[model samples]
Target chain A: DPEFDLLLKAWKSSGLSVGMKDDELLALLESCSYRVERLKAEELYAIGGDKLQDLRIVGVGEIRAEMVGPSGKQILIDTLAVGRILAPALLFASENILPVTLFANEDSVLFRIGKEEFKGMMHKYPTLMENFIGMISDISAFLMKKIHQLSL
Target chain B: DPEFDLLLKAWKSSGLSVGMKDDELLALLESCSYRVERLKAEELYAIGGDKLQDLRIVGVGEIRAEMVGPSGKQILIDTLAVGRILAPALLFASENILPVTLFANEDSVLFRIGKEEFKGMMHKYPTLMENFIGMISDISAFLMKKIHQLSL
Candidate 1:
C-alpha cells in the first residue's frame, strides 16, 4: 500500500545516525512512531533535540504559516491557507536553527524521528540533498508569490 | 516567577475535558510538561488525547511575528522581535474542522494542559473568558495591520 511504500521511503531517506544496524533502526522507527488525530486549539507539544529523530509524517492536517525574515519581521505566506508543503518551512523560520510551531486543524497522523537518527540519515544519504533542495525551492516559490500578491 | 505565574494562569484557564481526575491530570502534567531553550526548524511533537488534560504553556525564546490571512497568505510583521505574545488563536485552529498551519520564528518554551482540566478551570474562573476574548482581539488587530501594510 501507499502507506507501506511511504514507510519504506522514509526508512531509506530518513537520515539516521551512523553505525546503527537496519534492525535497530527499524525497531526505533516502530517504537517511536504513531498516528495522531486532529489537534484542538492551544494544544501544545514540546519538541527537544532528543525527539528530532522522529519524522513528522503529516498525512492530513491544516496549518497557518508565517516566516520571520532576517531583519526580524513576520511574513505571512499563502501556503498557510491552502495547506501545502511550503507551510512547514514557513512555520519553522530560520533554515535549521530554531523550532517551528505546528497546529493541526483536521485529523492527521505524523511519524517522528529522533535527532541522532536524523543526523545520521542525513550523513548517509547524500540523495536527501534532493529533499532538502526541494523544500528550499518550495519556500522560495511561496515567498515569491507573497511578494507578487503584495505588489498587486 | 513570571513563568510559574504563566503556568498557573494557563492551568486555571485551560479547557480540559470531562472524565479526568486531578491526580491523573497532575501526573500527566509532570511527565509531559517541559521547558526548552530553543526549537529548531521542522521539529514536531505528537500529543495524544489522553495527555491533553490540563494546560499548554508557551514562552518566547525569540519573537518573530508575521501576518497571515484566512487563505494562508502571509506578510512579515517584525524580525528578531522579543517578548511579544504569539497568537492564542493559533492554538484554537488545531481543533477546528479544517487544518490550520502554525509557524514559530523564534525559540520557545511550551506548557500543556488536558482538555478536561482546562474546562473545569474555565468553569471556576469565568475570567478566562476575558483572556480568550483578549487573545481574539489581538489576532484581529494583527490581521488589520497586515491589511494596512499591504495597502502601503
Candidate 2:
C-alpha cells in the first residue's frame, strides 16, 4: 500500500501530470511496471550509454547523476530525491545517449518504464505529451542558466 | 519569387520538417508572413528580455547570439547563417525568455513567426511536433557539451 501511495505521490508532483486529472493519471501509474528495482549505495544504476529507453523515477532514497566529459573530469550533474525524474531533458535528446551516469547515493528503489511504452502512453493522452514538453522546456532553460554561470 | 524560394529552401533544411513532406511543408511556409525583416551590421535584433514568442529563421547573411551574464561577462552563444534556426531549444523554454541577445553580424534577412501560430500549425501536423522534439533534443545535448567545456 505504501508503494502504491508513493507512486501516486510522484505522479501528482512529477510535472508529468500537469494537465491530467487524478483519474487519468491513475491509469498511467497502473500501466507502469510495479516491479521495484533496488540499487545499493555507490552501485551504478544506468550508463550514459546508447540511446536510452528505460525511464526511471526515484521512489525511495537518493541518486546522483554525473558526467565524465571529454576533459576526463567527472562532474556531478545532479543529486535527485524521491518524486524526481532522472535527467528529464537528456531522456528526450535526439541521440538519446544519456549524457550522465546514474548511481544511487544510498540504497534506493525506483519505478521504471520503457521509452516506447511511454510514447504509447503519450499517444493515449495528448496532455501527457504537452506535460513532457513543458517539463523539458523548463529543464533546458535551467541548463542555459548553468551554462551562463560556467561561461562567466 | 526569390524570397519565396528562400523560405522554401530554409524550410527544407530546417529540422522542423523531419517527417513532413514538401507539400505539407509548403503550406507551413505559406502560413508565415511574406513580409521580410532586415537588420544592419551590428544592429540588435532581439533582446534576451522577457519570454519569447517570435521565432525567426535566418534567410540571408550571418547573425550572432550572445549573453551578458551575472558576472558581466559576454559570451558568444552562436553565429547563425542562412537556413539556420536561431537558438532552437531556447525558443521552447517553459519561461521562454530567450537566454541570448541576437544581432546581425552583417546586413541580414529573416523570416519570423509567432509562437502561438507555430503551436497551431503543430496541431494540424503532428510530424512538426516530432521534428521540434528532435531539434530541441540535439540542441540541449550541444549545450551540455559546451557547459562541460566551460566547467573545465
Candidate 3:
C-alpha cells in the first residue's frame, strides 16, 4: 500500500498528466521519500559502448546522444540541451535499440526505475501507460519538428 | 568592407573587449573580404586526409564531418551544426589533412578564410584570435570535467 501510494505520488508529480493540480502533485511526491540519484561523469563513460541497454535517470543535467555503429564508429546524433524531455523513443530511433544507456554530463541527480518495474507499473495502471505513451509521442514529434527546422 | 562590417558586428555582439566598436571592426572586415571565399563540400572532401591549417564556417545549414582513414574506415566525427565556428585545432585533433569536407546536411551557405588570411586578421585584431582560443579552451575544459566526473 505504501509503494502504491508512492507510485501514485510520483505519477502525479511528474507533471505528466493534464489537469493535475500542483498542490495535489506536490502532496503526492512528498508522501514518498522521492530521492533522485546522482551520476558522476566516469559512471557515464564506463557504460558508454555496449553497456547502455540498462540506463535510467530520475534527475537533471544534459543528455548527449551518440550512435555507435556495428563497425565501432561513434556518431554524435544530438546534444539535448537543458530543459528537454528525456525521450526513450528518440534514443530508440537513434540507437535502434529497445533499452539504451543514459549518461549524465554533469554531477546530477536522477530517480531511476528499472525496465521491469516500469513495465509492471504500466501494466498495472493502464491510464498511466496511456499518459506515458502520449508524453513519448510528444517528445518524438518535438524532435522531428526541430530536425525539420534545422533542415530548412 | 562589408565583411569587415559583419566581423565588427560579430565582435561587438560577442561580448568581447576588442577595444573596437562595431563600425571599426566592420571597416577591418571589409578590407579582408577579398581573401574570403566559399568552398564546396566536394572541394573539402577532395582535401580529406590532407592537413587543414585554417578555420572555416558553413554559414548555412548542417555540415557533416566524416573521417576516412588510410585503411578506408569511414567514421562520422561531428556535425558542423549551423552557425558554428569551425576551428583549425579541431581539424588537427581529428587528423584531417584536408579541410574537413562539408556535406550540406541541408542546403548550406558558407563563408571561409584561409589560414594566411586568418593569420593576417589575427595580427591586426589579436583579441579576435584570443577570444576564439578561449572558447576552444573552455570547451576542452568542459569535456575534461565531464570525463573526470564520469570516472567516479
Comparison by lDDT, 1 against 3, better one = 3
Segments in model 2 whose C-alpha atoms lie over 4 Å from true places: A1-152, B44-46, B96-99
Across A1-152, the per-residue lDDT of candidate 1 in tens digits comes to: 56544454444543322344666556544544344334454343334333333445444444443333344333453223221332333233433433333444454444444444544554555544446446657768976987998895
Query: For model 3, what is the C-alpha lDDT against the true structure?
Result: 0.48
Steric clashes per prediction:
74, 0, 19
How many clashing residue pairs, candidate 3? 19
* TM-score for chain B of all predictions: 0.44, 0.81, 0.60
Q: For candidate 2 chain B, which ten residues in a row score worst on lDDT?
A: B67-76
Q: Residue B47 of model 1: what lDDT?
A: 42
TM-score of every candidate: 0.36, 0.45, 0.37
Which is better, 1 or 3, measured by DockQ? 1
Maximum-lDDT candidate: 2
Model 3, A39-86: lDDT tens digits are 564233212322333224334555554443433354334544432334
A1-152: candidate 2 lDDT, tens digit per residue: 57888878877867787879888888877766645678777444334344344677788888876543432234446787887887666665665242344556688887777777887888999998988878879877887888898995
- lDDT: worst 10-residue window of model 1 chain A: A77-86
What order do you get sorting by lDDT, best first?
2, 3, 1
For DockQ, candidate 1 versus 2, the one ahead is 1
lDDT of 3 by residue, B56-143 (tens): 5545455665543332333445676544655445633543332233344466554556666767777777776686677678767875
CA shift of B127, model 1, Å: 14
Estimate the TM-score for candidate 3.
0.37
Tens-place lDDT per residue, model 1, B1-152, is 56655553344444332234556545544444344334444343334333333334444444334433334333444432232333445444444322222334445555544454545555554555555557567767986986898794
